[PDB]
Amino acid sequence: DCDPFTRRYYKEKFGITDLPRIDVQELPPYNGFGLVEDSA
Amino acid sequence: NPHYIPGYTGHCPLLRFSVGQTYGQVTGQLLRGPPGLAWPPVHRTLLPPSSMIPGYTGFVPRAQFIFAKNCSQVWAEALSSPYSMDDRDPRKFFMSGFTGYVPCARFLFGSSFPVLTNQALQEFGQGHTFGHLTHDALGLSTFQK
Amino acid sequence: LHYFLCDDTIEIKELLPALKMFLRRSKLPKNCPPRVYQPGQITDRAVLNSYGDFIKNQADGYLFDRYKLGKVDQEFYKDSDLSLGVTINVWGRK
Amino acid sequence: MRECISIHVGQAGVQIGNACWELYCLEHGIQPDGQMPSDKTIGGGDDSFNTFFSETGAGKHVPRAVFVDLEPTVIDEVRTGTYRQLFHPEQLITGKEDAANNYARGHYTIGKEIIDLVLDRIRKLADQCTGLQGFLVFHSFGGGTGSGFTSLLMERLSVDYGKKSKLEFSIYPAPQVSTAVVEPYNSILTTHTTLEHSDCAFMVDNEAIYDICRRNLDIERPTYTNLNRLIGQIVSSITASLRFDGALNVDLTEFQTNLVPYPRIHFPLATYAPVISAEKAYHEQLSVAEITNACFEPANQMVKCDPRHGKYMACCLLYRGDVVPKDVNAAIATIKTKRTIQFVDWCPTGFKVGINYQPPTVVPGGDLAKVQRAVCMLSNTTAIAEAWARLDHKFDLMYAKRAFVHWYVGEGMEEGEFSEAREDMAALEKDYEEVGVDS
Amino acid sequence: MREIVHLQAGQCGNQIGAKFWEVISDEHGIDPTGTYHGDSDLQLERINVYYNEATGGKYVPRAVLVDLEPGTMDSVRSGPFGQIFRPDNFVFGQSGAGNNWAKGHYTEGAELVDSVLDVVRKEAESCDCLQGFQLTHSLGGGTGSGMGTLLISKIREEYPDRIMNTFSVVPSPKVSDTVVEPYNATLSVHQLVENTDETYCIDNEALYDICFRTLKLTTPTYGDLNHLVSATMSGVTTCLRFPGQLNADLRKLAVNMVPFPRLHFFMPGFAPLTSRGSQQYRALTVPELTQQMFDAKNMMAACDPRHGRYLTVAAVFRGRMSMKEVDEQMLNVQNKNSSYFVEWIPNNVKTAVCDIPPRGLKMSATFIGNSTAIQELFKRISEQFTAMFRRKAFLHWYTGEGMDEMEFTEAESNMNDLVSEYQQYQD
């Protein structure tokens, strides 16, 4: 990447506008005793 | 950028009053701007940005006044502070330990120096009955009262 | 507010619900609270120069001129300016 | 990570330091707010500002300088100036009443009250430094604070800190141009403790820089804003090597050893070149062979003295910008062939050179021109004997009738201290005569 | 930050001080009511020096008003800026002084000073750090000469380490308006030379000559005469209230200008004075101002400095100016007038430059002079004393209320001790 000032020098002089900002558990099953809320 | 070369000995308007700068930028500032007096004048001398042969003895009109140039040429020319800031400005404060006076600052209490100076700058810029409550508790409880 | 017609100067008293003389006998300025002008600039008469001859009377030895050069303009309250029901800025007091 | 501490006491020390930190913010591209800009990029290292600044984790830089004065009238300019958001709010220490151009009112009565707050800030600063190198104290001889508050601060700091070199940049009284009336008194009383706790005290004055401001710059009427911008560049040319890289860099410790031949002879003079305006720089060619012959002229020393009468003792050239070492070498051998420039016999090697790779800077709205290079001269010579001869001729003519004495006595100074300080300069004037004679 | 207490007693001292508080109120933009109305913010950072904040954004001065007569106290309330003062500061007796020194210092002035000094110590105790005292009086009266030395004696016995600004109007040879002026003058210098750090001497006949030569006033009344003293009054202490470039407070003038404990009587001055006509013809520069300082006709005392020598000169500049032209022009004037300045003191002249000039002018300057020529002011008073003391005239009005003949010989011996020092150092 490059700074904003470097992007200013590249459009007034070379006449190009290049701005690419390139970047770089489930619960166990129920057994069968009690309630499903109590065992959980 | 019109100016005078250093070492110039002529007169410049307001040259004797301006301080702390060289002759160059003092003269460069003074040339362009009039202020109290008149600007440098409109006609500025200073600071710049034939059917006859020679030997002819006849009369050519208004040729005795033109000079310094040859016979054919003269024939050719003969024929031709935080106080001034707004209240909404975040810079309206004084840093810690400022000796200088701030109006309406001695009357405030229980605040730090920046908050107190900001407030000072802004100011300078600008039951019912015991019997009724505890009686008839049976119908309307103490929470109801 | 007293206003002597012979002198056009104003003295002011007070009536307590007296503190005597509120403002002294002087020509009341009209526009704004005026700044104190530098001394020697408030002369009634203008003079080119005094007499170069060393023998001279101090009150009599002045040559007056025809040009009002450094004259400070001042407006003063008079009987024509103030009438019944007009605001007056008494040294800043409206 | 090579560090320095700059203390500014008195009015002259503080007011020059207002123009020193003028420069360092724009050398390294730091805004007055303390935040580096986001749009513009400058050429400057992350260790380049570490000599004179400190990086705070919010990305705001803070100076390493302590501002002390006994009178609040000058410090309050800085607190409400353009650099309010720059300094530490505790670093600016405020007194109550000044020294009144009295030595004993800054060393015995008022100067004892805040000396614990002054030294504790130096203790707080030095513990933050990773590696320390020295001190740069700014004051003046003739004042009551620059003589008073300098005297006790550097005598307690030498006790606390053992072998760190101290570099004092003090304003010498001029021979003719002088402001106060107690200048011959306040200058003698400082030097009774400079000789024991100051290793190198660079010295400038007011009349020589006035005349330099007239011939070279062509300024008809100079203020104090003009002088502080010129002294602000010499100090930025001495501490250039710790911030930038070059060919042969000079260390703050080493030129303490190249410039002090005897333990009592440590008073050099500063000189900067090429000091020129904007109309003459574009016309001339300012090469290496001529910016160093400008330094050796009798009219270009920044102290009102004649260097022809004395003989030089030890020199030190400090270059900057685009310079190659060979042009410096031929520019030195052409100087030793000159007959007016006289060196002592016992010191055949006297010159020393240092080269940096950064050109000088210019402040917007300034007076100095944009030049490719610069040279700073720091000359130790025996010509200051005549400078201190006339000042001791001021002392005895006033001490003969005991004028102005009782203002000193009324604060705590004994009368007997006046005689002992005069006998110190009695010996020091004989030292330049003892050193200067050729064996 | 530095706090100054102002006192005024006597008719000549009351009216000049009332003209003093009028100038500085406009300088800092204070309305006659006490409300701040100004243009620049630099006038407000140091406002605690002269003024005290009241509740509601109203300002009051630090002045103590004392007289033995109620006549002039009604006049100060009746002035153009008279409403600003504190009604708790108006302490006064009811019996007139009668132009008598003993009626202000021993008989009737001994009952009022208990409540006079109580108001003074109430104002100074509210201050955080006090600097000094400024008092206005006249040397020839019965109040200002009697009570002037009474109050400075009692203040210094309780504030030892301070500075005293005694602004005294001295008697005049031709403009003498009381027959007992030699009696009232010699009776106050016994306490002025002992208990005053610096005294500024003002006569009446040099102020008329300034009003007739430099200013060319046709009718120089008392309203314009006291304003001349008022400008030098407010010009000496500009470095304590306004920012500057070479600052110098009141004790700095104490060190530079007092070489001996009893040579401290200063001649004052003002420096941009001009007539009304030639405002457009005068070039306002530092070389024009410096010639206006050392003119023989521009100081405010009845002494010719050409008849003596100079010990120490200090001049406080104001406005935007350079310092080379200040430092060279106050070195050129010392070298050209080499005979006048003494040879046993080098660098007689002390300069000071501020940054805010007064309103209505681009720059200004205040001149202060210590000279040996002030011995002529004390010589004529001493020889006027002898011709009246020889025949014991006008003496029973003094000896009839406690004073004795033995006090008169001691005071005249002190003038002879004081005037001998200037002549001794001259050669």
Ligand SMILES: Nc1nc2c(ncn2[C@@H]2O[C@H](COP(=O)(O)OP(=O)(O)OP(=O)(O)O)[C@@H](O)[C@H]2O)c(=O)[nH]1
């Ligand atoms: N070149 C230069 N000299 C200065 C400056 N400020 C003060 N001086 C010199 O300092 C000398 C006396 O010291 P001052 O600065 O006036 O006073 P001080 O040293 O602060 O001592 P105090 O007044 O007691 O606080 C004067 O003779 C001036 O020549 C300045 O900004 N630039």
Ligand SMILES: Nc1nc2c(ncn2[C@@H]2O[C@H](COP(=O)(O)OP(=O)(O)O)[C@@H](O)[C@H]2O)c(=O)[nH]1
């Ligand atoms: N310049 C000036 N002098 C004054 C004024 N009022 C009185 N004097 C002088 O004071 C002298 C007399 O002092 P006096 O009033 O008797 O002192 P007091 O009795 O203590 O009040 C006279 O010679 C006058 O010239 C004044 O308003 N301005």
Ligand SMILES: [Mg+2]
């Ligand atoms: Mg100071």
